[PDB]
Amino acid sequence: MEVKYRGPSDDKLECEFLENNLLSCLREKSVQDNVAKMTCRPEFLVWFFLECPTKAAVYHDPKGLRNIFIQDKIKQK
Amino acid sequence: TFGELQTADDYLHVLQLRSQNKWVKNYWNRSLQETGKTNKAHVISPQEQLR
Amino acid sequence: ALFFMANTAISVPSVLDTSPCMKQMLAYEDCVLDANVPQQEVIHPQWPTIWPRLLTDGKLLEFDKVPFHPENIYNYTYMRPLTKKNKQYLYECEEERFVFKACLRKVISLKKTDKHTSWDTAEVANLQLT
Amino acid sequence: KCFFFDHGLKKYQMFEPEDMYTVVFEGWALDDLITFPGFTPTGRTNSYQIGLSPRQRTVVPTQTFYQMQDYYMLCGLRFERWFRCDLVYHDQRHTKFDQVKNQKNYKTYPCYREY
Amino acid sequence: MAQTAHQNRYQGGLCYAQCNELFSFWNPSIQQCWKGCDFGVGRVNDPEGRIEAQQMCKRWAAELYWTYKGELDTIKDLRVHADMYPTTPQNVYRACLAGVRRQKF
Amino acid sequence: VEEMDTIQKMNYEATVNMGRQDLITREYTFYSDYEFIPIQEDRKQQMEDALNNLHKIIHPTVTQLKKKANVQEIQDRVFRKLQGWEGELNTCVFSAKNVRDSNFCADRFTNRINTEGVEFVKQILREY
Numbered sequence: 001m002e003v004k005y006r007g008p009s010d011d012k013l014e015c016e017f018l019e020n021n022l023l024s025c026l027r028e029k030s031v032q033d034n035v036a037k038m039t040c041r042p043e044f045l046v047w048f049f050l051e052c053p054t055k056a057a058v059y060h061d062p063k064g065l066r067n068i069f070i071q072d073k074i075k076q077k
Numbered sequence: 078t079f080g081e082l083q084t085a086d087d088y089l090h091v092l093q094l095r096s097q098n099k100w101v102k103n104y105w106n107r108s109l110q111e112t113g114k115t116n117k118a119h120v121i122s123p124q125e126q127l128r
Numbered sequence: 129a130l131f132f133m134a135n136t137a138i139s140v141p142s143v144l145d146t147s148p149c150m151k152q153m154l155a156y157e158d159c160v161l162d163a164n165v166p167q168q169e170v171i172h173p174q175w176p177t178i179w180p181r182l183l184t185d186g187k188l189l190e191f192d193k194v195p196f197h198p199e200n201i202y203n204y205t206y207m208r209p210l211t212k213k214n215k216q217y218l219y220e221c222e223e224e225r226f227v228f229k230a231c232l233r234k235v236i237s238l239k240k241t242d243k244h245t246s247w248d249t250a251e252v253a254n255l256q257l258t
Numbered sequence: 259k260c261f262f263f264d265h266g267l268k269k270y271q272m273f274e275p276e277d278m279y280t281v282v283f284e285g286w287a288l289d290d291l292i293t294f295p296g297f298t299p300t301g302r303t304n305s306y307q308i309g310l311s312p313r314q315r316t317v318v319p320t321q322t323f324y325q326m327q328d329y330y331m332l333c334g335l336r337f338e339r340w341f342r343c344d345l346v347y348h349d350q351r352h353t354k355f356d357q358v359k360n361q362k363n364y365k366t367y368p369c370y371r372e373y
Numbered sequence: 374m375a376q377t378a379h380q381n382r383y384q385g386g387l388c389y390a391q392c393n394e395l396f397s398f399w400n401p402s403i404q405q406c407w408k409g410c411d412f413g414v415g416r417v418n419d420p421e422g423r424i425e426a427q428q429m430c431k432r433w434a435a436e437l438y439w440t441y442k443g444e445l446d447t448i449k450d451l452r453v454h455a456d457m458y459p460t461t462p463q464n465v466y467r468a469c470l471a472g473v474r475r476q477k478f
Numbered sequence: 479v480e481e482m483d484t485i486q487k488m489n490y491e492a493t494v495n496m497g498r499q500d501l502i503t504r505e506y507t508f509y510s511d512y513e514f515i516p517i518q519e520d521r522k523q524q525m526e527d528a529l530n531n532l533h534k535i536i537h538p539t540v541t542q543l544k545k546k547a548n549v550q551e552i553q554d555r556v557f558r559k560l561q562g563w564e565g566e567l568n569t570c571v572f573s574a575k576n577v578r579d580s581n582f583c584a585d586r587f588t589n590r591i592n593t594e595g596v597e598f599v600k601q602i603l604r605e606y
Contacts, residue, residue, distance in 0.1 A: 014263040032180040038190055042178050042301030047259075078202040081439040082314050086370045087200055090356045091489055098492035105502050117509040169302050179300065193299050197485070206300045312439045316460045321401070352497040359493045449544050 009051045018048040019055055023072055140258040149231035156221065156228040163217035166205045170218065173225045173232070182210050261294035270294035317372050336372065343369035377407045385410055391475040397455045402468040405459050408433060409472020417476045426476075430469035438462040514572045521584035528591040532556075532599055539603040548606060555602050556595075563590050 009015075025040035033040075049056050058064040160170050169179045169188070181187050186209030198204055210218070246253065261272040271291045297304045318339050323332040347368050351357045355367045367373075374382060382389045385407060392406035412429040416422030431445050440462040448463055451470060459465045479490065517525075536556075540549050570583035 009263075011263065013265050013268055017263065017268060029177060029180065032184065041296065043296045043298070045301070079439060080311060081441070082371055083366050084200055084202070086356075086366050088196065091197070091199070094357070094492040094496070095488055098488070098495050101495055101499070109502065109506065113506045115505045115507070117507050119509040169300055172302060188300050195299070312436055314439055315462070319458065319460060321458075352493075357493060357496040359490070359497070 008053050010054060011051070015048075015052040015055055018044055018052055021045065022048050022059070023068075027072070027076075144255050146254055148235045149228060152224070152228040152231045156224045159221035159224050160218070163214065163221060165210070165214045165218060166208060167210065167214075169206060173228045179206075182206075183215075185209050264291075267293075315371065340369055340372040343372050374404055374407055376404065378411045382407070388472065388476045392472055395453065395455075395471060395475070396457070396468075400455065400458060402453070402457055402459050402464065405465050405468035406472035406475075409469040409474070410476050412469070413473040413476035414478075417473065418478065423473070426473045427470060430466055430473060433469055434462040434466035437465050512572075515574045515577055515580045517571060517580060517584050518577060521581060521588070524588050525584065525591070528588050528595070532591065532595055535596060535599050536603060539606055543606070552602060552606060556599055559595065559598055560591075563587055563595075 021041055021044040025042065025045055028035055028038045028040040059068065156173055157171060163170075167175075167182060167186075169175050169182060172178060175182060179188050186207050188206045193204075193207075195203055195205075240247070251257070261270045263269070264271045270293065272294045273288060273291055318332075318336045320329075320332065322335060323329065326332075347355065351367060354363065355365050356370075358364055377385070379385050379389075382393070385392075388410035389407055392403050392410060395406055396402045409426075409430060412433075413423065413426040416426045419425075434440065434445060437459075438461065445462060445466050448466070451467055453467050453471050457464055457467065459468060482490065536552065540552060543549050543552075564587075567583055567587040570586070571580050574580045574583060
């Protein structure tokens with residue numbers, strides 16, 4: 001197959017969508033999917049690590065992930 | 078998924094049922110009301126009884 | 129006919145597979161195939177975390193599916209929880225799953241640094257020239 | 259990645275396979291955009307090498323007329339066999355076969371394979 | 374003999390000759406019989422090799438046609454006749470078993 | 479039967495409509511056809527009972543035969559006698575004037591099945 005090359009998008013809106021899906025998946029899977037309604041889409045998780053390298057590196061960093069978790073907890077009250 | 082024709086026929090009888098329902102309703106209404114004649118249609122030729 | 133092409137290039141070999149953890153992936157997939165599990169999500173070594181409902185009730189979708197109605201056995205395969213036999217024959221494939229996951233994590237830990245002066249000519253080392 | 263993120267909808271969309279001329283010189287005029295549903299319902303992988311599934315039993319063999327690439331005599335023969343089977347069972351279909359009201363008495367129509 | 378092991382039927386040996394004698398010349402079951410000859414090469418004389426070859430025939434029949442789990446285990450008559458054609462997995466299994474039976478050495 | 483989703487309702491409607499083909503087409507009758515007094519429902523039930531009695535005798539024999547050719551031969555041998563009797567019944571019922579005549583013909587056919595049909599079937603099955 002003749003597959004052309006295009007680097008990771010790092011688009012603001014696309015990465016916001018993928019990061020929202022990632023946060024939903026983290027919150028759902030951290031309790032073994034005990035939520036009433038599960039909105040996580042595992043497939044988009046893959047794309048989060050293919051088109052948002054900056055946010056992926058932030059999530060891997062322990063301090064960045066701690067900040068993200070704190071902000072998500074504040075948002076979820 | 079094993080696609081033996083009996084299991085596939087069990088899968089596909091529902092879709093065939095809906096398609097047949099649509100076809101038969103259209104058949105009844107349009108075809109029969111527009112073409113068929115009910116209750117023994119026939120052509121009547123009278124003759125006067127002569128003297 | 130006999131020698132119409134006048135030459136055959138037997139020197140060019142089959143393309144060598146140089147994927148990072150391909151051998152471990154294939155070993156794990158063979159092992160999972162041995163278990164004979166209807167659920168396909170088990171193909172990924174991360175299934176206990178990605179689809180934890182496979183171990184509790186099997187409800188992997190919130191009624192947002194399109195596999196048709198539950199009229200035959202070959203329906204809602206992912207909506208079917210793992211039974212005791214499936215769990216046992218998947219546990220028998222635990223070491224290979226762990227090796228695959230360790231290989232994946234080590235590959236993830238590999239980062240492109242500034243000392244990789246051979247990055248622009250990595251095809252030769254990847255053995256793409258025949 | 260056969261799908262593209264849309265800023266107006268802020269979600270992934272896709273369209274049917276299109277030629278390069280239409281993708282490049284008609285990118286502004288795109289029709290029939292459908293929200294991307296995913297390759298698999300559960301998000302697993304579907305990238306597998308495929309092969310030919312096992313064949314099915316034959317009631318009327320193709321080898322009766324196989325020297326001919328055009329299947330017209332074979333078509334007639336198979337339809338005649340199915341019509342015999344149907345003449346046997348045509349009026350019992352809605353009471354003993356596929357067209358029953360309740361699935362309790364459901365049975366596959368005997369002429370399914372010939373049909 | 375696209376599914377068998379030999380380029381021509383003469384390399385199969387006495388087993389292929391017996392398979393040819395088993396069915397009429399237009400019957401495609403012969404090829405399946407030939408596969409039996411392939412399954413019982415080094416297995417016919419071994420007491421468990423014969424069972425292994427029969428299992429190989431069952432797997433081959435299951436792979437050629439769609440089959441059900443009990444279908445090949447409830448066959449009343451495993452005998453074959455000249456006009457038995459490989460239209461069903463049962464017929465494929467019977468032809469393969471007949472080929473296995475005719476594999477000396 | 480009221481409570482169901484759209485798909486189940488459509489399937490139920492399809493199953494109901496596939497059985498009303500006899501209802502829809504009963505209005506479209508032809509003037510030039512040759513009408514006959516039909517076989518009454520009780521006579522239909524008696525004839526079906528006679529057929530079931532015949533099937534009772536043949537069942538062990540046909541289920542203990544492992545060759546399709548033998549079962550087909552048994553089916554063909556009985557079917558010739560049954561077809562002769564069916565032809566007699568069809569003639570005498572088509573040429574019937576009142577329900578009494580149709581009942582007489584149906585009773586004659588049923589009596590032929592129950593008297594000579596069972597004897598013929600038993601002889602065939604003993605041969606097999």
